[PDB]
C-alpha cells in the first residue's frame, strides 16, 4: 500500500524498459495531473502469453 507520496508517473512511463503499460479508466500520460486517495501496488511473475 502506497500513500502520501508525490507519485511521478511521468518519469516512470517514459522508460523504454517496460514492455507492457496498459491503463484502464485513466489515460497513461494524464496520470500526472490527478490526485489519488491510496494506490495499491501488486507484484508477481507470470509467463508471456
Amino acid at each position: 500500500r502506497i500513500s502520501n507520496c508525490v507519485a511521478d508517473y511521468s518519469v516512470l512511463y517514459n522508460s523504454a524498459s517496460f514492455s507492457t503499460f496498459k491503463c484502464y479508466g485513466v489515460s497513461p500520460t494524464k496520470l500526472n495531473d490527478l490526485c489519488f486517495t491510496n494506490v495499491y501496488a501488486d507484484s508477481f511473475v507470470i509467463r508471456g502469453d
Binding site: 489515460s27 494524464k30 495531473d33
Partner: protein
Amino acid sequence: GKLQDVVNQNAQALNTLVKQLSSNFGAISSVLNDILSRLDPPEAEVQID
C-alpha cells in the same frame, strides 16, 4: 389549485431535468469535467457520447 398545480408541474419537470445530470447513462462518471480530466480524447470520446 388550478394555478398552483401548473407551477408545481413546471418546477418538478425542471427538477427532474436537473437531476438527469447526475446520471451516468453508462459512462464511468457523470461529471463531464472529470472524465475529460482523466481520459485521453480518443477513448474519452465514447464516454462523452
